[PDB]
C-alpha cells in the first residue's frame, strides 16, 4: 500500500533517479493489483544517499510528489515537483 517518505537533500542531491513517460495520461496499468494511470518510478537508488536512508527502493512507483498527485503525469511535471523545495522532498510511493 502507498506510504509517505520525507527526504532531505544532500549537496549531491536526493540520491535517486526517476524514470517514466514523457507524455501525459495513457493506458492504465495495475500496480500491486490496484489500477492506476501511468506512474513514474524510481530507477536507481544511490547506496547511502538521502533516498536510500529514507527507505526509497528501486522500482518504487511515485503516486504523489510534495502533496501533488502525479498519477498519469509527464516526466517533466514530476521532475519539476521534485525540484519544488530547496532541500526537502515528500513522496508518496508504492513498493513493488
Amino acid at each position: 500500500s502507498p506510504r509517505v517518505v520525507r527526504i532531505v537533500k544532500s549537496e549531491s542531491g536526493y540520491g535517486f533517479n526517476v524514470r517514466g513517460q514523457v507524455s501525459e495520461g495513457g493506458q492504465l496499468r495495475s500496480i500491486n493489483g490496484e489500477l492506476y494511470a501511468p506512474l513514474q518510478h524510481v530507477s536507481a537508488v544511490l547506496p547511502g544517499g538521502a533516498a536510500d536512508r529514507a527507505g526509497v527502493r528501486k522500482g518504487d512507483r511515485i503516486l504523489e510528489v510534495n502533496g501533488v498527485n502525479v498519477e498519469g503525469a509527464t516526466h517533466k511535471q514530476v521532475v519539476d515537483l521534485i525540484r519544488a523545495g530547496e532541500k526537502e522532498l515528500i513522496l508518496t510511493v508504492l513498493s513493488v
Binding site: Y14, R19, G20, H75, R83
Partner: peptide
Amino acid sequence: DDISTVV
C-alpha cells in the same frame, strides 16, 4: 521510450 533524470 521512457526517460530518466538523476535527482
